[PDB]
Each structure stands twice: as structure tokens, then as C-alpha cells.
Amino acid sequence: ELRDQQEQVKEDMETKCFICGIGNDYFDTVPHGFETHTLQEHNLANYL
Amino acid sequence: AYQQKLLNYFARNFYNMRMLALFVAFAINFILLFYKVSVHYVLEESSGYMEPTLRILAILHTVISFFCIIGYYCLKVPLVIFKREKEVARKLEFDGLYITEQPSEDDIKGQWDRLVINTQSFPNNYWDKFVKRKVMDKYGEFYGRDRISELLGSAVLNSIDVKYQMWKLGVVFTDNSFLYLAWYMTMSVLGHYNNFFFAAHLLDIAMGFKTLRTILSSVTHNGKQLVLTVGLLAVVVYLYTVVAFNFFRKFYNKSEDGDTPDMKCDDMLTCYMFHMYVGVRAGGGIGDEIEDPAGDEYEIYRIIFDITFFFFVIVILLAIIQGLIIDAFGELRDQQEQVKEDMETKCFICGIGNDYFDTVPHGFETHTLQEHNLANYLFFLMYLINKDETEHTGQESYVWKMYQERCWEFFPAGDCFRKQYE
Amino acid sequence: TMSVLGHYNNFFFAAHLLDIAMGFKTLRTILSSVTHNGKQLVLTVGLLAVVVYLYTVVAFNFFRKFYNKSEDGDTPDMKCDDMLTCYMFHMYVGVRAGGGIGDEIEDPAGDEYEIYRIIFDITFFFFVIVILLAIIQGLIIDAFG
Amino acid sequence: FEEKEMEKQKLLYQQARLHDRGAAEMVLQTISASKGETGPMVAATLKLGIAILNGGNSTVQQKMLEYLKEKKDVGFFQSLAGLMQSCSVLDLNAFERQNKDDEFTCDLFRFLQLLCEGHNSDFQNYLRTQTGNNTTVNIIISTVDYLLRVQESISDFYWYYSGKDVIDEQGQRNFSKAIQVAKQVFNTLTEYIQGPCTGNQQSLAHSRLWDAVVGFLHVFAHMQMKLSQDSSQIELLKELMDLQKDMVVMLLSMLEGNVVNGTIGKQMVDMLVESSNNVEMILKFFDMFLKLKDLTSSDTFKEYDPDGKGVISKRDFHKAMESHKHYTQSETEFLLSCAETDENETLDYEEFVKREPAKDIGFNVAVLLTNLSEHMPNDTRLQTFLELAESVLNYFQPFLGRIEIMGSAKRIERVYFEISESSRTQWEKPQVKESKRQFIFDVVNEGGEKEKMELFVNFCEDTIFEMQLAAQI
Ligand SMILES: [Zn+2]
Ligand SMILES: [Zn+2]
């Protein structure tokens, strides 16, 4: 279980956006897009 | 001319040559089964000619393993090169790694390539010798024109590029597929020397079959986790062994009764290597192989030493480690399983799925054998290269322009032809 | 045909009780579970064949002396060095011990090959007993599951 | 390969020697001044303007347009129009008299081809409308009208030899010369439309061209039936086949900018009923030659010949071929009238299958018909016409590629291409199948969606290099 709880977190950072929650699929419409939604749009440190 | 054309036989016949290597060695298993001692010895029951057939086969199998690798050296190896010279040269254009980026001290696979770029031959097998010029014409205005041109550039003994060939064989050695067969040749060599190590060839059964490579892959799948886990078991066991050292040294008596020269386990090296031999592997723990506690102050204290050793070590830490292979095996087959599902669920290219094409009967097979049918995108891309850019159609020339750019939006995302229309 | 031979010899006559397998629906499945994944299994067990054969050769070449079925050597000391017998030792003993070879052999006690025997051993125990049995065990269970 | 691009750059370097020194404009000016002239002046210009281009040099194609838009010279296109009003037909009247002129014209339109090849959709639209200038001159309309008067003459040459049927050398040398007229000018009408600027497609859709292309089919049917008849008529036939190739290249290119039930597809179906009659020949004419290669080497002609070299008699052919129950007896006569009837009655399997050339053309036809179906279905006008051509597509379904791409119109269109026999065969067997299975697992295991289609070709380029290996093995 516990590794699976570790596993899902690593998935969850790659599946969904941490903040806006939407997911990988909506941002794969633009190429290289989920990484942009993780490095430009929300990119956790900025809200910090 | 007899050398090259015979070498064309081996690449055609490699897979039969390599399968036959398993067929031969499987008989070497059957014949090494017949040894005994006297100094080493071979008894031949039911036949007298079978030991000279081992003299036959040992020479046979080895040089077969020599003819396979020298057949492999032109079968996949140049593709390996092709892949590797590709890797560099796109990164010389697009990244300019030896112009600009200078890859890290890790991945020497990157840093192995520094040597080859100065050579004349550099993209031998890439069909695109114009790359070395194109990098000069992209970056040489910026940084250095004739500095980058300095960076880039009987009859058999002086014809070859040495700096290429040193690089090449380096990349040949770093291939997993080569180095296996390389390691397979060295076991064959020593069989001509000593026929004992000769039947260690039977581990071709592992990488031969697809379900047994996976199981040894399952060992190293989760290996990064494993070694840290086994290290845990190292430590835990070391913790028990110290307690045993300090509190319970007397209980260790390998001997009979003490009247014999009573062998005891108190030295720390030996005591620690006791529990990895005995305490790990007992399956019942230490308390199987030791004096049962029978009336001491440390009677109770021995038991509490013991069950704890048994829940933590034997029950938890073995079986996890046991598990972590199995779990990897279970994962890994499941990764194999999902792929076979994924080819049948979704289309490889357009990604849509089985359900949309089951609307037409026998339809997903049509979407897999007419619409996308993977080989065609291969073959189309041949077709682009096989023709000239004059003769290209507007559709083709598009794609070719997409291709030379490497921008890739030509594929169907999901909007394949049936989905696009009615 | 099992019924025929019962009219001949009444011993083989009660092998009919394997109708309990194909009779009930949950017990046909369990023997089906054996051959469900059988194509995988036989290749896997073959693995265990080979691995065990690899240990037995090392044992043959490096560690022949450790095998003494007998009492003390003063008895007509039965040892396991012939390769047929030595290989069929580990499938009887080394596979099925559940603790490995190092349960049923001389414990190493002071040789140059003392250390080398252990490293022979634990490896035999993680690879064989812990991994390869239980996988094979599992691959039925997994099929059953 | 690598020898060629450096040669291509040698080409481009000798072109660079010129057009950097304003050579591009001298062509463009001289023609513009030579208004209706088809003087030798103009002939020298075009063979220069061709040599400036030669290969789709885009710099020139840029610079050529620059001089037209900056100095808005309406005279240029006005001059080009008048060219094509003149250039040439074949003739028939003087051919009667020659029993006892194109070189300018070929190279006129090869010039015009190279103005556009490379798909300058700006320039291809510039030849439509000529926006900056005052009077529009539609070249693309007029080149159809040149091709139209090409057609009627090509038509007219057939009827003169509709009776003699052993066509003279003066007939051949006159007409093969005319073959290279049209073959070139079709290629313009590709490369006008081949850049899929649909403005140029619609402009030509309403033009007369279809009536030509109908009529070429009437040529190409009835020629091929009697060009087959001789062992001397094959050389013109090889040309007329090759024109028939490039003729259907054309309307494939016209069909690429197509929605499913699109109007430009409608027109193409419309012609195939108006000219249904004659296509019945060329569909059978291929089935005469496509079944031929598949039988004469199949099972009981390579075993039925006593020789093994490839020699079989006429009677040995007629009793075995007709017994295979593929086609009927009137075509066995047709093929034996076609064959050679050689030395007494014998015939080689080599030269008889050398008239294999039709598989190139009929591919494209089968491509055409498939693309008409897969774009525009459910029209029995087409369906009935297609099901006759079943035997043709049956030959090429092994060999026709069919993919999907999103080719810039943001709808995904479908593209056909030639699958080679060598590359198909090499793909399946040796290690490539072991290499693909290796690939397919690697994608789904660790592929990002950007990286997936990128890793794709990364296989494929290898897999190109696979067969470059495994076939030279
Ligand atoms: Zn967000
Ligand atoms: Zn698809």
C-alpha cells in the first residue's frame, strides 16, 4: 500500500496539475504542453 | 571477395545460427551430465565415440559462436552505429552540444562522441554526410568559423580512419546485445581450454525466450530498491548479532556436547556470517539452530531475542525481498500485458480506441490494417526519401517539409478519417 | 479404462476420485490453473532447471567433498560427486529443502572454501528458493487468481 | 545520394553565379518585351530561364516574383498569354503534305513549371490573378486552352492512323515529338495545382480541361489497342503510356484538396461516366497485362515450357493460357496478335511482359479510383465503374500505400503512395519483425505523447536503414 501511495503521488504530479487539477490530457493538445502547464502556468513556486 | 560474400551468408542465417547454438549447447548439457571423478574423468556408457563428439562439438560450438558475432557485426551493429551517429548529429544541429552545450561528466555515452566528430568519416552510415557542413553553416558565424572547422575537419593498413574505428568499436562494446554475445564468445573460448565452463552457455535460455528474460529482468527491475532493502536486512541482522555477541555468546555450539573440541560462534566476523548463513536462511530462524533456552536468567531474554528475529527478519524482511522480485515480476508481466492490450485497445497512432471502430463490423481490424497499419508510415517515409523533391506532391512535400524540420504535427492526433467525417 | 483395470486389479480402481476435480466447478479450475499459464510455466521451470544446473556444476568443480550422506566417513561413506546423481541431488534436496542446500550438507568449518561455500549458498537460496520456487508457485496461483 | 546533393549544390552554385548578378530579371524582362513574339530571341530566353531554375530554386522563384510585383509589369503576363495562343499544335494538314514545331513550346511550359515547382502558392496564385497589376491574365486558364488545342490535335492524329494501323516512322517521329508536348504541359497543370492552393484548383475546375482529359482517354484507349499490335510500335507506346502516367498524375493532384463529398471530386466522377466507354479498354488493357505477368511466370508456364530459358510457342500459349480461366478467347488472340509471333510461332516471356510498364500507370489509376471512392463514396455511377476495375485494384492493394495525415488543412486527408515490392518483402521477415516488437513495447512503456510520434521515426529511420542492410545482404 505504502509504495502504492508513494507511486500514486508521483503519478499525481504527472497526471494532474497540482493546483488547477485538470490533468494531463487537456494540455497534451498543445505539444509539450503539460510541461508548460507545470513550468509556466502554475509552477508551484510562483504561488509561493 | 570470398570473405564479403560469405559474410553475407551469416547475416541471412544468423537467427538460425543463434538458435542452433542453443540446440547445440543443450546437448552439451546432456553430455556434461556424464562426469565422474577418479582428478577429473569422463565415463562413456552405451557408446565409445561420444567423448570425441564432445571434442567435435566443443570446437564446433565455439567457432559457431565466432561465426555468429562476426555475422552480427554487420547485421545489427551498423544499425547501432546508425542510431548512434544519428543521436549525435541531430544534437549537433539542433542542440550543438559540442558547440554549445557540453554534456555532463555522467553519461560518458555522450562524452564518448567527442572524438569522432573530428574524423572525416563521421556520419558513415547515416546517409547524410552533409551534416558536418551544416553545423559549420549554422554555428560558425556565431562562435568560430575555422575553429569549428578545426573541430570537425598494403592499401588496407592505411585506408581506414583510425579515430573513427577507435570510436566505433567503443560503441560496439557498449551495446548490450553485442557484449552479451561477446561474453558468450569468451565462455566458448574457455571451453576449448576447459570443458567445464563450457556448458554455462545454457543461460541462452534466459535471453532466448521472452519469458525468461523477463524474470531475470525482474531481478534488476526494482533493483535500486532492492539493494537498499537487502541492505536493511544486513543491518538488522547485524543488530541482532551484536546483541547476541554481548548477551548470548554461550548458546552457540556447533559441536557435540562440549566434550568434543567445542566449536562456538563468538568472533564477530564469524558470528555475523553465522546469521546470514544460518539465521537468514533457516526459515525458522536462529532458534532452530541453537541451544534451546532451558533455565537461565537469559532464558526469557533469549526468546524475546528470538521471536523478534523471526517476525522482523524471516517473516517480514525475507519475504519482502522475495516479494520485491515477484512484485517486479508481477509488474513486468503486467507491463508486457498492457502492451498487448494497448495494441488491441487503441490505435497506435491516432490513439482513439477499439470502441469507435466497432461501430462498423470488423472495423478495428480495418483501422489497424488499412487506415494506419503501421508499416505504411514507415513506407511513406521511404517514399519521400526515395523520390525527389520536385516530384513530391503537395501533400508529400508538406510532409517532407515537416520532416526536415522535425515538427511532427502531420500525424493524426485523434482526428482520423472516420472521425473527421460521415 | 480405469474402471476396466479395476475388474483386473482393484488398486487402480480408486483413481476415479479425480472426478471430484472435473465434477465440481471450483476444482476443475484449479487444475486448469495449472495449465492456464502452462506455456509460461514450462519455460520457467526450465529456468529453474538451468539455474540449478549451474549451481551443481560449481558444486562439482569446487565443492565435491562436502557431500556425505553417511555417518562420519567410518561407514561406507556415501558421497554425491557423479553428475547425474549430483544434479538429481539438488532437485531432490536443493529445490525441495525450503532452506536450500545448506541445510543438507556439511556446514563450512575452516576451509579456504568456507567463505566460498557460503556465497555459493545464499545465492542459491535467494535465487532458487526464494525467487524461483515461489514464482513458479506463484505462477499457478496467479493463474488461479 | 550524397554525390547528388553536392552535385545539386553545384547546380545551384552555377545558378547562383547568375541570378545574384540579376540574371533573373533579364529573363523576365525579355520575355515581357517580346509581346507576341516567338522569335529566336524568346527561345533563347527560355532555355536560360529554365537553366536558372532547373530544379526549383526558390531564390529565383522569389526574385522572379519580386520584379513582377515591384515594377508592376502587366506586359509580362500579357506576353505569356500571347505565346500560348501561338505556340504549337501538332498538325494534320502538312503531315499529309510531308508524306511526299515544338521545341520552343516544350520549353515554354517547362519554364512555367519551374516557376511553380516547389509549390510557391503565392506565385501559383499570382499566375491566377496578378493582383497588383491592372489587367488580370490567367495563365492557368490559357494553359488549359493550350492543352485543349493539344488534345484535339492529338485526337486528330489518331484518326489518320485509325485505319493504317502500321504507323509510319514519320508518324512516330511526328507524334512522339508531340508526346513530349503534352507530357510537359500536364506537368504544369500538376505543378499549378500540385501546390494545393485550391484557388487554383477551383479556377481550373470550371475550365475546359476536363473535356480534354476525357478526350485523351479516347486517345489513350484506342491507341493502346493498336499500338500493341507491333513490335515496332512499342517505342511510341512507351511514351504514350508515360503520358498516360502523367496525365493521371494530374488529376490526382487535382483531387488532393478534397472534402469527402467535394465538388472537385464530383467533377471527376462526372467525367468517368461521360467517358465510361473508353475506360473500359484501359481497365481491361491493364487486366490484359497485369494478369499476364501473374500467369506466364506463375505455375504452369515455368513448368510448361520445356526449355526453362523462357521460350514458348504460340499454340502452347493459346491452349494453356485460355485454360487458366482468367480471361476469354478474344483477348488471347489480342495478346497473340500483340506478342511477337517470333521465329516461327514462339515468344519470349521477357519481351512479352515488357509490354510490367503498365503497372506503373495503372497503379496511379487504381490510386485514383480508390481515392475517388474513399473520398466520394456511395455513387453507383462510381461503384459500377469501380467494380469493373476491381481486377486492377486487386493487383495494387498489395502495393498501394494508404495513410492519414493532417496536411495542413487541419482536416485529416488521405494519401496514397507506392509501396515497393522490395521494401514490403524485406519488412516482414528477418529481424525487422524482431525489431518492431522491440519498438512497440518501448513506446507504450515509457512514451510521452510528444515523444511518441517523435520516437516513431526514430524507429523508422532505422527501419529504413534496416532494409538498406537486409536487402543488400
Ligand atoms: Zn493549475
Ligand atoms: Zn490511427
Q: How far is CA B384 from CA B194, B204, C54, D416, D472, in A?
A: 55, 41, 53, 12, 20
Counted across chains B and C, CB pairs separated by less than 8 A come out at 84
Is the separation of the CB atoms in B178 and B77 below 8 Å? yes
Distance CA C60, CA B211 (A): 29
CB contact, 8 Å: B411 with chain D? yes
Chains touching A (3+ CB pairs < 8 Å): D
CA A7 to ligand 1 centroid distance, Å: 21
Collapsing DSSP to helix, strand or coil, D420 comes out as coil
Distance CA B122, CA B87 (A): 12
Taking phi over 0 as left and psi of -120 to 50 as alpha, with beta for the rest, A31 belongs to beta
CA B206 to ligand 2 centroid distance, Å: 35
Q: List chain B gaps (C–N > 2.5 A) by preceding residue.
A: 38, 153
Chain D residues in contact with B86 by the CB 8 A cut-off are: 458, 461
Mark C90-101 as b/e (b = at least 16 C-beta within 10 Å): beebbbebebbb
Our CA-based measurement puts residue C24 at a distance from the nearest CA of chain B, in whole angstroms, of 30
Q: To the nearest 10°, the Cα dihedral for C123, C126, C132, C137? A: 150
For an interface test with D, the pick among B15, B382, B385 (most D C-beta atoms closer than 10 Å) comes out as B382
CB contact, 8 Å: B8 with chain D? yes
CA B373 to ligand 2 centroid distance, Å: 8
Q: Do chains C and A touch (3 or more CB pairs under 8 A)?
A: no
Distance CA B100, CA B138 (A): 12
Contacts 24+ apart (CB under 8 A), D289-294: D289/D355, D289/D356, D289/D358, D289/D359, D290/D358, D290/D359, D290/D362, D290/D391, D290/D392, D290/D395, D291/D326, D291/D327, D291/D391, D292/D335, D292/D352, D292/D353, D293/D353, D293/D356, D293/D359, D294/D395
Taking phi over 0 as left and psi of -120 to 50 as alpha, with beta for the rest, C75 belongs to beta
Collapsing DSSP to helix, strand or coil, D154 comes out as helix
Question: Considering only CA atoms, which of B407, B394, B402 is closest in space to residue D415?
Answer: B394
CA A35 to ligand 1 centroid distance, Å: 11
CA B353 to ligand 2 centroid distance, Å: 9
Residue among B215, B263, B280 minimizing CB distance to C47 = B215
The number of residues in chain D equals 473
Rounded to 5°, angle at Cα B240 from B238 and B245: 95
Chain D residues in contact with B15 by the CB 8 A cut-off are: 430-431, 434
Question: Considering only CA atoms, which of D210, D91, D89, D75 is closest in space to residue D144?
Answer: D210
CA D109 to chain centre: 16
Give the chain B residue nearest D418 (alpha carbons).
B383
CA B228 to chain centre: 21
Distance CA D85, CA D75 (A): 15
- CB neighbours (10 Å) of residue B46? 6
Q: Cβ–Cβ of C98/B283 closer than 8 Å?
A: yes
Q: Cβ–Cβ of B277/C121 closer than 8 Å?
A: yes
Chains touching C (3+ CB pairs < 8 Å): B
Chains touching D (3+ CB pairs < 8 Å): A, B
For an interface test with A, the pick among D449, D451, D453 (most A C-beta atoms closer than 10 Å) comes out as D449
C-alpha cell at B347: 490505435
Q: Cβ–Cβ of B130/D55 closer than 8 Å?
A: no
CA B391 to ligand 1 centroid distance, Å: 48
* Protein residues placing their CB within 5 Å of the ion ligand 1: A 17, 19-20, 42
List residues in chain C touching B: CB distance below 8 A: 40, 43-44, 46-47, 50, 53-54, 57, 60-61, 64, 81-84, 87, 98-100, 102-103, 107, 109, 115, 118, 121-122, 125-126, 130-131, 134-135, 138, 142
- CB neighbours (10 Å) of residue B366? 15
Distance CA D43, CA D107 (A): 8
CB contact, 8 Å: A10 with chain D? no
Q: DSSP code of D346?
A: B
Chain D residues in contact with A32 by the CB 8 A cut-off are: 450
Q: DSSP code of D306?
A: S
Question: Considering only CA atoms, which of B60, B31, B56, B61 is closest in space to residue B43?
Answer: B31
For an interface test with B, the pick among C52, C82, C116, C140 (most B C-beta atoms closer than 10 Å) comes out as C82
Amino acid making up residue B196 = F
**In chain B, residues 103-142 whose CB comes closer than 8 Å to chain D:** 125, 127-130
Amino acid making up residue B363 = G
Our CA-based measurement puts residue B105 at a distance from the nearest CA of chain D, in whole angstroms, of 25
CA B368 to ligand 2 centroid distance, Å: 8
C-alpha cell at B53: 563428439
Is the separation of the CB atoms in B83 and D461 below 8 Å? no
Chain B residues in contact with C80 by the CB 8 A cut-off are: none
For residue D414, give the H/E element and its range.
strand D413-418
| D230 half-sphere exposure, CB direction, 13 A CA radius | 16
Distance CA D342, CA B398 (A): 50
The number of residues in chain A equals 48
| D46 half-sphere exposure, CB direction, 13 A CA radius | 24
CB contact, 8 Å: B389 with chain D? yes
What Å resolution does this PDB entry report?
A: 4.2
Determination method here?
A: cryo-EM
Strand-pair partners of B371: none
CA D193 to chain centre: 13
Amino acid making up residue D350 = E
Q: Do chains C and D touch (3 or more CB pairs under 8 A)?
A: no
Our CA-based measurement puts residue A7 at a distance from the nearest CA of chain D, in whole angstroms, of 16
Rounded to 5°, angle at Cα B188 from B186 and B190: 75
Q: Cβ–Cβ of B370/D402 closer than 8 Å?
A: yes
Amino acid making up residue D237 = L
CA D190 to chain centre: 9
- CB neighbours (10 Å) of residue D398? 9
Is the separation of the CB atoms in C84 and B33 below 8 Å? yes
Residue with cell 576447459: B194
CA A15 to ligand 1 centroid distance, Å: 11
CA D405 to ligand 2 centroid distance, Å: 10
